[PDB]
Design a binder for these strands. Structure first.
Ligand SMILES: Nc1ncnc2c1ncn2[C@H]1C[C@H](O)[C@@H](COP(=O)(O)CP(=O)(O)OP(=O)(O)O)O1
Ligand SMILES: [Mg+2]
Ligand SMILES: [Mg+2]
Lengths: 396, 542
DNA sequence: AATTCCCCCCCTTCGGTGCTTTGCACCGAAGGGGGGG
């Protein structure tokens, strides 16, 4: 069996340089690729193949085993082309089913697009090039060629247990039940066994939106009122109806920032009305499947990060916090990587699409250190923001 | 001979045809050298005579090798290169002697006539047609086509690098204890065996290479130290760069300055303290490469310092995987940094510098982080692992910066070393307004037609000023207004701006800017004892 | 006016992109050097 895969019209293919890797990662990649070539999953190629995608290795959580990962984002973009009850389940377990992927041969006209290069320590030898002969882990057309086989290893359980909702994204099966955990963790063992003969728990309901909140204090100084007016004017873009027209009248004339301004009755009324408006959810935003998701992350300090997922500016589909109380990993890069992975997982759970990330980090630091903490099998598209936010206290 | 290795299939780009470029006139000495080279190549089967059936041509020429007694025949395959299919290069970097481990026995081998020993794809040979012009015109030219990899073709290096890898794979698999560094046709071979057994293994490798049509002439077979390998001299315990010659010219041109900067950058890999910023600044603004550039006083002082560094004999050491990598960083001033990677004190594995200027405005902490990232990536390339850093920044300073910075930033395992100058932030912005300090409400306006603008402020005590500005923009007027606010205040000041450009720069704690308004504000911010800056939405009634 | 190719690096310049304070800041590609074959 072979599916005639094709690229998007007028698209060449991935040509991405291989980034340097550590000695442990290179040794793991060499061993994994030697085993894969011995099994025929990958084949050595020469330089006449002009395409290339980056490759590296990760160590999944509580695994102590190296896994080879390929950055197929460019190939996914160039390739020629949701369980809504999943967000409401209580326990969603993620299972790696990328191993069953390496048994379906890939179309020979498409193998050249899956080329990758293993580098060498100290450039002692030229990089070793391979291409995939089978469906690779990381490519978006790979789950689109196993759908048939998946919806047949699944049917004998997706019907015996009609309550459990199963979704598949890339190499991951998100299986979400409403059973007691001890039970959901036995069904999942049963599903594992039922995938063994045929060949990480999320809690989507304990997920909350972070609302826009105004400060509550006894006395309001000029600085406090100026900060409140700025926050309310910024929020007026998101929530139309925010007056902030009489709170901008207590700030009339030149006054010291530490001067206490008594809050007038009209000002207090308007403040209470604006608090009520901010408390109620924003109405009028709908997930458009044709558009792409954008996730913005803001560092808040003390291991706190805020994030907003939206498709149009100021129309937020989700707002949240990733609070990893800076403890042993006082690594900003580790916290940011862990936040990106969590946001991507909830985006796939809710909308089925990974978001494009606006990372609050220098590009070079990210490319240096993100592979050291990544533990997912997917990689989202990310762009790097090089401008202070200030609208960072408007989300925390 | 010619390798029995399989040829790499090569095709032209879709819809394109072979080159039809005429041969340019050639010097009679060059013509004779090319005639003799082509005669020997045709006798060996490396090139084949062709007739009218081939409509393609490509200019040929010759240069002088490092042998200075033999000629290197080159073909100007630029048209064919443009019409040739794309390749992926397998050479991802350059080996470094600092990444070499100590070996009891070392042998350097150079494969003779490397490219011309690897056959070329038969369907692609017709596109490699060239013509050797006759001495003094008159007779028609002898037309050949390449049967092997030509020098000048964009596919030759990668194809040769793959062929050499394939040839070396069996020997390396059957001798896993022998270390072979393969860079094109250059082969470094290190082993811990005795000299007799090592020479036996070297002879075995030479026989293995000769069976694949690759000769290893004794002329370029090095058996005794020092070994000339990849631009370095390798001794049993130490390595050094091959001698680096700095011009002693009294008149410098743009090209000469570029050459000197490149040579000093090359020498900075092992010679500590090499600085090039003053000399590199001479290249800005210039145009012609032949334009004589008068060396400034700062440039002359850096050149003298670099010369004083390069007269002493320095050497690197070989990597010891049992011990730990330590990279120590020092500030050189003016955004320049040196670093030394070593495993034992006073025995450097390698040396380097970082002087890249990223961003219009930055501080020493950001540049130190950039230098740490550069050293980390270089160490991952060379030794495959991140070193332990000795940074001239206090842990408190880094803690304050990275906790109070709006970007995610990190530095790997590092310890503070008390070697001045130390990396520190030169001012801090108050998190809350200062009680008892005059509050400045500042603003800057500029119509974008006449390029004239206003910078003004008023204080809570009644003072105000409205300086006018020429040829400034809105951004620049807001920066000017903040500058007035800083100038006309005491040691403690509250400033309220309605500009997020201004506040965005000033909040990143710059210590140096590629602007004199930001640089001037920086000196005012370092003098004040406490400064709170606040943004207020603009036209709102505030 | 001498004409080639591939690889790594540094340093400087320019045009494109993104945001929207329309100038300014930033990043990649391309030019010059160094080194390697
Ligand atoms: N300037 C240049 N232009 C194009 N290609 C160049 C090159 N310098 C080296 N190369 C490539 C081709 C050589 O085959 C190969 C080996 O580099 P080499 O300079 O040692 C000469 P090789 O042809 O092996 O023969 P021999 O002189 O040792 O007998 O490196
Ligand atoms: Mg040589
Ligand atoms: Mg040679």
């Amino acid at each position: 069996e072979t599916v005639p895969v094709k690229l998007k019209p007028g698209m060449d293919g991935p040509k991405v340089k291989q980034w340097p890797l550590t000695e442990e990662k290179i040794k793991a990649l060499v061993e994994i690729c030697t085993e894969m070539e011995k099994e025929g999953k990958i084949s050595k190629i020469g330089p006449e193949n002009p395409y290339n995608t980056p490759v590296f290795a990760i160590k999944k959580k509580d695994s102590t085993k190296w896994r080879k990962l390929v950055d197929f984002r460019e190939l996914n973009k160039r390739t020629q082309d949701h369980p809504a009850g999943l967000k409401k389940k209580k326990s969603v377990t993620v299972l790696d089913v990328g191993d069953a992927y390496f048994s379906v041969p890939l179309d020979e006209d498409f193998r050249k697009y899956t080329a990758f290069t293993i580098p060498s320590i100290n450039n002692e030898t030229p990089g070793i090039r391979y291409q995939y002969n089978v469906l690779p882990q990381g490519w978006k057309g790979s789950p689109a060629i196993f759908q048939s086989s998946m919806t047949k290893i699944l049917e004998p359980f997706k019907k015996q247990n009609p309550d459990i909702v199963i979704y598949q994204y890339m190499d991951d099966l998100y299986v979400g039940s409403d059973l007691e955990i001890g039970q959901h963790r036995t069904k999942i063992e049963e599903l594992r066994q039922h995938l063994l003969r045929w060949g990480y728990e999320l809690h989507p309901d304990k997920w909350t939106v972070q609302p826009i909140v105004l400060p509550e204090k006894d006395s309001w100084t000029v600085n406090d009122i100026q900060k409140l007016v700025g926050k309310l004017n910024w929020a007026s873009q998101i929530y139309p109806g925010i007056k902030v027209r009489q709170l901008c009248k207590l700030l009339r004339g030149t006054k010291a920032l530490t001067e206490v301004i008594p809050l007038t009755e009209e000002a207090e009324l308007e403040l209470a009305e604006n608090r009520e408006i901010l408390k109620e959810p924003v109405h009028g935003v709908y997930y458009d499947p044709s558009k792409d998701l954008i996730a913005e992350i803001q560092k808040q300090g003390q291991g706190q990060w805020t994030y907003q997922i939206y498709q149009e500016p100021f129309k937020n589909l989700k707002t949240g916090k990733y609070a990893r109380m800076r403890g042993a990993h006082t690594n900003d890069v580790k916290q940011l990587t862990e936040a990106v992975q969590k946001i991507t997982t909830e985006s796939i759970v809710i909308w089925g699409k990974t978001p494009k990330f606006k990372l609050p980090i220098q590009k070079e630091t990210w490319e240096t250190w993100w592979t050291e903490y990544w533990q997912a099998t997917w990689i989202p598209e990310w762009e790097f923001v090089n401008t202070p936010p200030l609208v960072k206290l408007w989300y925390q | 001979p010619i390798s029995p290795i399989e040829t790499v299939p090569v095709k032209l780009k879709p819809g394109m045809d072979g080159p039809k470029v005429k041969q340019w006139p050639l010097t009679e000495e060059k013509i004779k050298a090319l005639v003799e080279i082509c005669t020997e190549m045709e006798k060996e089967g490396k090139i084949s005579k062709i007739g009218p059936e081939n409509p393609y041509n490509t200019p040929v020429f010759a240069i002088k090798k490092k042998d200075s007694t033999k000629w290197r025949k080159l073909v100007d395959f630029r048209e064919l290169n443009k019409r040739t299919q794309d390749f992926w290069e397998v050479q991802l970097g350059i080996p470094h002697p600092a990444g070499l481990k100590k070996k009891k026995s070392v042998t350097v081998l150079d494969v003779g006539d490397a490219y011309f020993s690897v056959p070329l794809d038969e369907d692609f040979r017709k596109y490699t047609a060239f013509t050797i012009p006759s001495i003094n015109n008159e007779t028609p030219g002898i037309r050949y086509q390449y049967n092997v990899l030509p020098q000048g073709w964009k596919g030759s290096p990668a194809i040769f690098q793959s062929s050499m890898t394939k040839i070396l794979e069996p020997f390396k698999k059957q001798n896993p204890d022998i270390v072979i560094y393969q860079y094109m046709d250059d082969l470094y071979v290190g082993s811990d065996l005795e000299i007799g057994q090592h020479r036996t293994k070297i002879e075995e490798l030479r026989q293995h290479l000769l069976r694949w049509g690759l000769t290893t002439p004794d002329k370029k077979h090095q058996k005794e130290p020092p070994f000339l390998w990849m631009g370095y001299e390798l001794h049993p315990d130490k390595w050094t760069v091959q001698p680096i010659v700095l011009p002693e010219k009294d008149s410098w041109t743009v090209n000469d300055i570029q050459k000197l900067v490149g040579k000093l950058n090359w020498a900075s890999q092992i010679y500590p303290g090499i600085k090039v910023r003053q000399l590199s600044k001479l290249l800005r603004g210039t145009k012609a490469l032949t334009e004589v550039i008068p060396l400034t006083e700062e440039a002359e002082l850096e050149l003298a310092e670099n010369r004083e560094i390069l007269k002493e004999p320095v050497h690197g050491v070989y990597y010891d995987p049992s011990k730990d990598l330590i990279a120590e960083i020092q500030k050189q001033g003016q955004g320049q940094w040196t670093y030394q990677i070593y495993q034992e004190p006073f025995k450097n594995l390698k040396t380097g510098k970082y002087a890249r200027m990223r961003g219009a405005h930055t501080n020493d902490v950001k540049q130190l982080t950039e230098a740490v990232q550069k050293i980390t990536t270089e160490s991952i390339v060379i030794w495959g692992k991140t070193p332990k850093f000795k940074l001239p920044i206090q842990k408190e300073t880094w803690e304050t910066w990275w906790t109070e910075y709006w970007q995610a930033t990190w530095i790997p395992e590092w310890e503070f070393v008390n070697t001045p100058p130390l990396v520190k932030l030169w001012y801090q912005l108050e998190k809350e307004p200062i009680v008892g300090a005059e509050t400045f409400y500042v603003d800057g306006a500029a119509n974008r037609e006449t390029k004239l603008g206003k910078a003004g402020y008023v204080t809570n005590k009644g003072r105000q000023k409205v300086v006018p500005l020429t040829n400034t923009t809105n951004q620049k007027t807001e920066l000017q207004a903040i500058y007035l606010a800083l100038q006309d205040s005491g040691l403690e000041v509250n400033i309220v701006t309605n500009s997020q450009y201004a506040l965005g720069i000033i909040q990143a704690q710059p210590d140096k800017s590629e602007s004199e308004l930001v640089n001037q504000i920086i000196e005012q911010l370092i003098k004040k004892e406490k400064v709170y800056l606040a943004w207020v939405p603009a036209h709102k009634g505030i």
